[PDB]
Design a binder for this molecule. Structure first.
Ligand SMILES: Cc1noc(C)c1-c1ccc2c(c1)nc([C@@H]1CCCC(=O)N1)n2[C@H]1CC[C@@H](NC(=O)OC(C)(C)C)CC1
Ligand SMILES: Cc1noc(C)c1-c1ccc2c(c1)nc([C@@H]1CCCC(=O)N1)n2[C@H]1CC[C@@H](NC(=O)OC(C)(C)C)CC1
Ligand SMILES: [Mg+2]
Lengths: 116, 116
């Protein structure tokens, strides 16, 4: 039944995104979209058909593109699954992604309990 | 008596797993282990005694846990059989599983032929 007010969603959810940004160095690969030309990885978009990154999620929060909090959680989880799929378990970026996922899991659980 | 090296298997088999990940929305329930507490299905682990999902399979490919290609195929097929067993034929999840199974059959057929 409930309609989420855009600023209510933004206020509840942005602290969880801000917690990811504070992770340095782990958030740095995730602060802007993956650029396969800069990185020299022409197969990236062969494998990742739905790219996502922190700046895109932040812009969707700013502009009211999320109707309900699970749409935001789905984008954060998509971001992580893209990096875990494309990069090997031993790689730096994969370990960075796991650290962000660890932080996100700790932040998001009490927030979603209070929203639903 | 051919020996299959970890990286050899990974290069051959990873594309077939990547093809499943590309299916959206159908791969989304399969990208992480089933969480019966999150989903509110407490009998899940009564029926599924050997859970399996894409992220676990990907990890086993990354870490060399498959000795031969059929061990990978067996895990993908276990994944599917778990979903078809637990969910009814008319359910969304079951239909999503069938879609992944159709993609997998098309992708694995030539790969297995080239490996043997
Ligand atoms: C995620 C992901 N998933 O797969 C992959 C693959 C990634 C991913 C993405 C970015 C990565 C990254 C891995 N490795 C690094 C760096 C550089 C190379 C290797 C290294 O060791 N450290 N970067 C940086 C690239 C550009 C930087 N900023 C940026 O573009 O500055 C402007 C001014 C706008 C030009 C910041 C981040
Ligand atoms: C397979 C299978 N076999 O039996 C069953 C049963 C499944 C199965 C499994 C997952 C399912 C699923 C069915 N239905 C959905 C969604 C939500 C439920 C209602 C719906 O209509 N669609 N999900 C999602 C659950 C959580 C999602 N992500 C996730 O955990 O995010 C973090 C951040 C880590 C918390 C991704 C997938
Ligand atoms: Mg953990």
């Amino acid at each position: 039944k409930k309609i989420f007010k855009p600023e209510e969603l933004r206020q509840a959810l942005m602290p969880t995104l801000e917690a990811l940004y504070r992770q340095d160095p782990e958030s740095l690969p995730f602060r802007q979209p993956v650029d396969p030309q800069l990185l020299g990885i022409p197969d990236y978009f062969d494998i990742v058909k739905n790219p996502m990154d922190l700046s895109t999620i932040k812009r969707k929060l700013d502009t009211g593109q999320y109707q309900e909090p699970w749409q935001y959680v789905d984008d954060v989880w998509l971001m992580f699954n893209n990096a875990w799929l494309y990069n090997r378990k031993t790689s730096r970026v994969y370990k960075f992604c796991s650290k962000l996922a660890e932080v996100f899991e700790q932040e998001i659980d009490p927030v979603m309990q209070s929203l639903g």
